[PDB]
Each structure stands twice: as structure tokens, then as C-alpha cells.
Amino acid sequence: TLSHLVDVVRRAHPDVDLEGAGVHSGQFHDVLIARDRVFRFPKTAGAAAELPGRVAVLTAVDAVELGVGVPVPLSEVRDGGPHGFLVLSRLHGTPLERGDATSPEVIDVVAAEFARVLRAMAGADVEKLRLVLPVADAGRWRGFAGRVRATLFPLMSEDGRARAERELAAAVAMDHVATGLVHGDLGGENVLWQQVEELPRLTGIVDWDEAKVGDPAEDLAAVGASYGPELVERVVALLGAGDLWPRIRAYQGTFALQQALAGAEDGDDEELEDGLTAYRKL
After folding, report:
1. How far is it, in rounded angstroms, from Cα 153 to Cα 161?
2. 70: which residues sit within 8 A by CB, 6+ positions away?
3. Does the annotation flag 51 for ligand binding?
4. I need a surface site. Which of 8, 74, 133, 269 has the fewest CB within 10 A?
């Protein structure tokens, strides 16, 4: 097929060199990663409704004015190829390694790069975002707990189950907050940085698949898990978000179960095993 998809790209985008071009497939989508450009090709008539969804999410997030790049639709969605395609900008930069992020001469700059984005996200017009983006569901953690018990509890030690029930409970116990833009997966791999005159600059954020109107504590939890307490304390201090700590820890206590449940539901055995290590001694 990919020579057809390449045929579609060469026909629509004659300039694009597919020699040494990234390729990421699936049951859902083929993606050609060119130099300046990404091409998403749905595989079924159903997955094609993703394309306007991706446009609408990226357009709404762009309209918030985060102060950092997000992928831009470079074309309209087109009905070329079997089920249509979308051309997005490619953002440049690299994830910050935890040791680079936390050096004493950069940790203040890194904290403020996270803070200025998170502040703009927390301050988004949620009345506008709610017409386009998903909204955090108040029942979300009760549902998640049901699935973790159905799917993962059998594979656990008794101690594993006791530990999981406490972590699931801290999440179910949170009152519902839907006051801001939430990226929803703001681990370090999704945040791109460049050295700008010898100091880190947060230049782009990618992978807006889980974006929603939600709780700003959820993205602080992810920053904390990727970079550790020294960085997230500085981000929280700068934002004046010290009231959020109990919610931040409740999100973080769910990250291994989130990983394990995803592993099971997605057939990724490494994620399932890695997620479950704290929940079985055997």
C-alpha cells in the first residue's frame, strides 16, 4: 500500500523526499514523517473522522496562545488516498533528559518554561474550549477502577490489590475540576526543547490526543513523574499551585495502573509487565 500512499503524496506534494522518511503504521493510520511535514493516512472509513477532530483540537489549542509551537494543519483535510489525509507541520527539538532539566544552572529556566505554558493552559477560555474539546468526566476514576479490578486484580498479589485499592481510591476521592486546558499526557517525550543561546527553550508540544478541559493538577503530575520533585516544586511555587499537591499525588499514584491497563488493552506486553511490578512480588 505504502507505494500507493507514497503515490498519493508525490501526486499532491511533489516536493516531499520520501527517501529516509519516518514511517509509523498501526491498525488505524499510516504516518509519513518528512522533513518539515507529517502526512496522516487513515486506514478505514471510520478512522477518517479523526482528521477533522485533529484539525479542530490543534486549531483550538493554537488559539489559546500557549507561547510555544503546536502542530499546525498545513493543508485542509483532503479526500485523497483511500480514506483521506492530513498534512501537519513537524516541530523541531528534542525531549529534555531528566539530568539536563535538573542541573542547577538551568532548573529555574526549565521550571519557568513549564510554568508559562501551564499558566496559559490554566487561563484558557474554557467556555470556548468546551465546544471543541472533550471535558473530564466526573465518573472517570470510578470507571477506571472497575476496569483495573476486572483486568489487572487477578494478576496481582493480595498486597498488590491493597496498594491498588488505595491509589484508585485517592483518585476516586478527588472532586471534579474542569477549569483549564489539559494536555493529558505531558510526560517529557511530548515536550520538545532547543538550546537557544546556551539555555533550554520549550519550543513545541506534540501528541494532543488526550487534550481536554480538565484539572491542571493532571499535567503537573506528569511533569513531576518525568522530572522529579525538585523540578515540579519550582513549577508549583512559580504558579502558586501549592493547594494542588494532594490532587497531583492522587494522579501520580495511578500512573503504573494506567500503564498496565493500557498494556493489556493495547497488547503491549512490556507495558503490562512494567506497570504491574509494584503489584506482585512473584
Report:
1. 6
2. 58, 61, 62, 91, 204, 205, 206, 208
3. no
4. 269
Longest dimension (CA), the chain: 60
**CB distance 262 to 138 below 8 Å:** no
CA end-to-end span of the chain, whole Å?
Answer: 45
Tell me if 25 is assigned to a ligand binding site: no
The residue to which cell 476496569 is assigned: 147
Q: In this structure, are residues 212 and 184 in contact, taking their beta carbons and an 8 Å threshold?
A: yes
Helical H segments across the chain, by residue range:
2-12, 50-64, 98-102, 107-122, 126-129, 140-151, 158-172, 216-227, 229-239, 245-253, 255-266, 269-276
Could you tell me the CATH number of the domain that includes residue 123? 3.90.1200.10
CA 98 to chain centre: 18
Q: What is the dihedral of CA 39, 42, 45, 47, to 10 degrees?
A: -120
Cα dihedral 85, 91, 93, 96 in deg (nearest 10): -80
84/107 Cα distance (integer angstroms): 44
The cell numbers describing 37, all together, are: 511535514
Q: Which residue range forms the structural domain that includes residue 216? A: 94-276
Neighbours of 99 (CB within 10 A): 7
Find out whether 75 is annotated in a ligand binding site: no
Catalytic residues: 185
Elucidation method: X-ray
